[PDB]
RNA sequence: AUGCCUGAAUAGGGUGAAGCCAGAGGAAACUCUGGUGGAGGCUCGCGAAUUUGGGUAUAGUAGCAAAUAUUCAAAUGAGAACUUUGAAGACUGAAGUGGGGAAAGGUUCCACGUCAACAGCAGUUGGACGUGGGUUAGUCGAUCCUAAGAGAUGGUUUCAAAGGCCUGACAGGCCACCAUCGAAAGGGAAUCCGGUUAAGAUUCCGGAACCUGGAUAUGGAUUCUUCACGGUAACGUAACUGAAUGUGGAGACGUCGGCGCGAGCCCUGGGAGGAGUUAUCUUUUCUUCUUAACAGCUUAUCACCCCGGAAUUGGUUUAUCCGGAGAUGGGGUCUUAUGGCUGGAAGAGGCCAGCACCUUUGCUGGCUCCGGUGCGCUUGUGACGGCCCGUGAAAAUCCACAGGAAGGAAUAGUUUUCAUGCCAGGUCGUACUGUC
RNA sequence: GAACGCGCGAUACUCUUUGAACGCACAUUGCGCCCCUUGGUAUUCCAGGGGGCAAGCGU
């Protein structure tokens, strides 16, 4: 499995011809400041690997979710 | 276990160390 | 009324060995019909087959 | 706490090791008093050099 | 070395009979 | 074998001693007109060969067993 | 009797040899005292003996087949001391009466029915009988390689015509050396976790990943048009052509000792759950709080490089070894073994609580957190020191280096050890038990 | 003659694996090479089938 920090790379991954499904996973976890927050993992598998994008920002995750292709199947959790 | 199956005759007479059969003499 | 296989399956499913499983003496007929591990799991869930705890003995 | 190697050796090899030690001690004690058991260096020292041998012959 | 391998036996024999 | 057929989408066949996985796959494909995902073969104690032929998701093994 | 090849083992307690450090006596040599160090024909539990697997040479009498402890209630059954469940008593006590393997056995594995025979009483029980079910691999082994040795060819490469390759609008040229067998413990490309059966698992299912071979396409580089740069250096890189020929590395190699580090186990504090005991005392005793292969970033003792030139000799190990053949000191380069963070991955696994049913009767909600410790056991590893000794088996296999043959440009020049993309992986073993 | 199967051999109440036994090995269902042909995207890959492999310094 691979991790990617690039949002547009993830979007390019989800835009290819051989894309099956994308998984959106939510984790309720605390940061070093002690205040808990919501972390979102976007997972899509390419040719031979599973690429994961981890976002600790809620607004960015919402924008990325709204920017996903409308013909792409998305697994919630 | 000094002997094993002989391919030519099927008896338990093939000496493993000598690689020869004591019943049909193979080969 | 031969629950040897039932005890074996219960020990395997719960994973606590045959010395920790408890088969209900008042439910021999019900346990006798548990010929599969799914039925053993059902019996464990219903409480007919129970898992005994580790002995309380100081180290 | 006993080590694993100690347990393995004491379970496997202790008896024959002790027996061989006993046999070696017995043989050494038996041949301690015998006459005719010398090392090669001692035999050479008793033999002496060549010049010592012409000295002895004279 | 062994340079005789430059001549086969028949050649060597037929040249020995020449002598 | 029938449990595997109805659940695992796998057809269990008996094949010859002289057949390999390529031949079993090709024979299943030709005789039953199905796509073979994989073939796993073993040799039984009674001197016969048993093959588990898993078909692709495009085919239902229950339908092929009934047909 | 003496061997040879490849593996396992060569342990522990005690004592305390050289060498070294600090002292005292003496002009040296030396001798005492304390420490350190960890060696041996040291001890402890002509002769004899000298661990081990695989391979390979030269009268219903004697008596009960001997391995201790059984008791109570219920179920089945014609029949119960011997079958099953529960309760009690007892045993093995990790060097097991516990879980696996090689060899060997061959269905003894699992289910259903049975007691004619067998399991030296009995038996409704079975390693018995009868009928069925069961062993799934690109990644684990064999298959490949060679070891001692065996053994074809004409005794093991020998007075053998013993074979492949290259060049060129049939001739010429290059090279030497022998088949094959022999290891499921030696060398070797690559797979992990969770779940699943009456009996199958690194093989099945789900997820995740690597290895080898092949054809090809795209991007990038190959910067004026033609095989790229940087740093004093060690060396760094997204690439960055390389024939014959000649070399180098890995494979690939004795044993022992202490020291340093990592991991698993053990010990332990707080807290979040569950269980036991409570006439009295006991913030108490038990148990859960886990993170795989693989992948990205980062992280080194040693070694090496540059500056510099050292006695008032310094540095320094537990072990007195190092320095003008360049120390101390200052600044750098490298191997990634091994830690850390992250993806895999919490969705898994675990511990709880609650709500559904004469039924596959599964639904829902929480917690799965933060630390400490070492003459501890197991194991891996680094730099050393000691002793023996052929500089410590071979081969398959992969890589690199010298060398400069050849090739490369105007409507897609050459190369593709950089990146991404496609396809495939046959035969045999796999159930069960188990002299090393 | 032997092994495995249904007197017989996958055409089994034509002739499997062998055996003097013949591509090489062999206590293995192990390892190759050559010619034709067929299929799966196919000039390369993979697989199936058929048939095979015990010159001279002489005149």
UniProtKB/Swiss-Prot annotation, chain B:
Subcellular location: Cytoplasm
Coiled coil segments of this chain: none
Residues engaged in binding Zn(2+): 6, 9, 21, 24
Annotated signal sequence range: none
ZnF C4-type: positions: 6-24
Function: Component of the ribosome, a large ribonucleoprotein complex responsible for the synthesis of proteins in the cell. The small ribosomal subunit (SSU) binds messenger RNAs (mRNAs) and translates the encoded message by selecting cognate aminoacyl-transfer RNA (tRNA) molecules. The large subunit (LSU) contains the ribosomal catalytic site termed the peptidyl transferase center (PTC), which catalyzes the formation of peptide bonds, thereby polymerizing the amino acids delivered by tRNAs into a polypeptide chain.
Assembly mode: Component of the large ribosomal subunit (LSU). Mature yeast ribosomes consist of a small (40S) and a large (60S) subunit. The 40S small subunit contains 1 molecule of ribosomal RNA (18S rRNA) and 33 different proteins (encoded by 57 genes). The large 60S subunit contains 3 rRNA molecules (25S, 5.8S and 5S rRNA) and 46 different proteins (encoded by 81 genes).
Other known facts: Present with 21800 molecules/cell in log phase SD medium.
Family in the record: Belongs to the eukaryotic ribosomal protein eL37 family.
Protein name, UniProt field: Large ribosomal subunit protein eL37A
Source species of the chain: Saccharomyces cerevisiae (strain ATCC 204508 / S288c) (Baker's yeast)
Lineage of the species this protein comes from: Eukaryota, Fungi, Dikarya, Ascomycota, Saccharomycotina
UniProtKB/Swiss-Prot annotation, chain C:
The keyword Oxidoreductase is annotated on this UniProt entry: no
Record-level GO cellular component terms: cytosol; cytosolic large ribosomal subunit
Residues that span the membrane, as ranges: none
Modified residues (Phosphoserine): 29, 36
GO terms for biological process, alphabetical: cytoplasmic translation
Primary location recorded for the protein, binned into one broad class: cytoplasm
Sites of the Glycyl lysine isopeptide (Lys-Gly) (interchain with G-Cter in ubiquitin) crosslink: 20, 52, 59
Subunit structure: Component of the large ribosomal subunit (LSU). Mature yeast ribosomes consist of a small (40S) and a large (60S) subunit. The 40S small subunit contains 1 molecule of ribosomal RNA (18S rRNA) and 33 different proteins (encoded by 57 genes). The large 60S subunit contains 3 rRNA molecules (25S, 5.8S and 5S rRNA) and 46 different proteins (encoded by 81 genes). eL19 lies in close proximity to the binding site for eukaryotic initiation factor eIF4G.
Other observations noted: Present with 97700 molecules/cell in log phase SD medium.
Task of the protein: Component of the ribosome, a large ribonucleoprotein complex responsible for the synthesis of proteins in the cell. The small ribosomal subunit (SSU) binds messenger RNAs (mRNAs) and translates the encoded message by selecting cognate aminoacyl-transfer RNA (tRNA) molecules. The large subunit (LSU) contains the ribosomal catalytic site termed the peptidyl transferase center (PTC), which catalyzes the formation of peptide bonds, thereby polymerizing the amino acids delivered by tRNAs into a polypeptide chain.
Name the UniProt record assigns to this protein: Large ribosomal subunit protein eL19A
The organism of origin for this protein: Saccharomyces cerevisiae (strain ATCC 204508 / S288c)
Highest classification ranks of the organism: Eukaryota, Fungi, Dikarya, Ascomycota, Saccharomycotina
Gene: RPL19A
Interval of the full protein contained in this chain: 2 to 60 of 189
UniProtKB/Swiss-Prot annotation, chain F:
Subcellular location: Cytoplasm
Coiled coil: none
Alphabetical keyword list: Cytoplasm, Isopeptide bond, Ribonucleoprotein, Ribosomal protein, RNA-binding, rRNA-binding, Ubl conjugation
One GO CC term on file: cytosol
Any GO BP annotation: ribosomal large subunit assembly
Any one GO molecular-function label of the UniProt entry: RNA binding
Role, per record: Component of the ribosome, a large ribonucleoprotein complex responsible for the synthesis of proteins in the cell. The small ribosomal subunit (SSU) binds messenger RNAs (mRNAs) and translates the encoded message by selecting cognate aminoacyl-transfer RNA (tRNA) molecules. The large subunit (LSU) contains the ribosomal catalytic site termed the peptidyl transferase center (PTC), which catalyzes the formation of peptide bonds, thereby polymerizing the amino acids delivered by tRNAs into a polypeptide chain.
Quaternary structure (record): Component of the large ribosomal subunit (LSU). Mature yeast ribosomes consist of a small (40S) and a large (60S) subunit. The 40S small subunit contains 1 molecule of ribosomal RNA (18S rRNA) and 33 different proteins (encoded by 57 genes). The large 60S subunit contains 3 rRNA molecules (25S, 5.8S and 5S rRNA) and 46 different proteins (encoded by 81 genes). uL23 is associated with the polypeptide exit tunnel.
Family per record: Belongs to the universal ribosomal protein uL23 family.
Protein name, entry field: Large ribosomal subunit protein uL23
Gene: RPL25
């Amino acid at each position: 499995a691979r991790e990617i920090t690039d949002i547009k790379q993830f979007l390019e991954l989800t835009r290819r011809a051989d894309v099956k499904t994308a998984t959106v996973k939510i984790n309720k976890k605390l940061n070093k400041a002690g205040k808990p927050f919501r972390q979102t993992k976007f997972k899509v598998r390419g040719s031979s690997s599973l690429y994961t994008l981890v976002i600790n920002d809620a607004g960015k995750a919402k924008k990325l979710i709204q920017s996903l292709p409308p013909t792409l199947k998305v697994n919630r959790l | 276990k000094s002997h094993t199956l002989c391919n030519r005759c099927g008896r338990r007479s093939f000496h493993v160390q000598k690689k020869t059969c004591s019943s049909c003499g193979y080969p | 009324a031969n629950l040897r296989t039932q005890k074996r399956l219960a020990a395997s499913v719960v994973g606590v060995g045959k010395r920790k499983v408890w088969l209900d003496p008042n439910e021999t007929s019900e346990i006798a019909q548990a010929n599969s591990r799914n039925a053993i799991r059902k019996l464990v869930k219903n409480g007919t087959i129970v898992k005994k705890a580790v002995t309380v003995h100081s180290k | 706490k006993v080590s694993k190697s100690t347990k393995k050796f004491q379970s496997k090899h202790l008896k024959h090791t002790l027996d061989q030690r006993r046999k070696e001690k017995i043989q050494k004690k038996r041949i301690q008093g015998r006459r005719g058991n010398k090392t090669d260096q001692e035999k050479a020292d008793a033999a002496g050099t060549r010049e010592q041998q012409q000295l002895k012959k004279s | 070395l062994s340079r005789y391998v430059k001549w086969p036996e028949y050649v060597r024999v037929q040249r020995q009979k020449k002598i | 074998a029938m449990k595997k057929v109805e659940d695992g989408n796998i057809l269990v066949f008996q094949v010859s001693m002289k057949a390999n996985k390529y031949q079993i796959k090709k024979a299943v494909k030709e005789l039953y007109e199905v796509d073979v995902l994989k073939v796993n073969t073993l040799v039984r104690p009674n001197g016969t060969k048993k093959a588990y032929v898993r078909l692709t998701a495009d085919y239902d093994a229950l339908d092929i067993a009934n047909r």
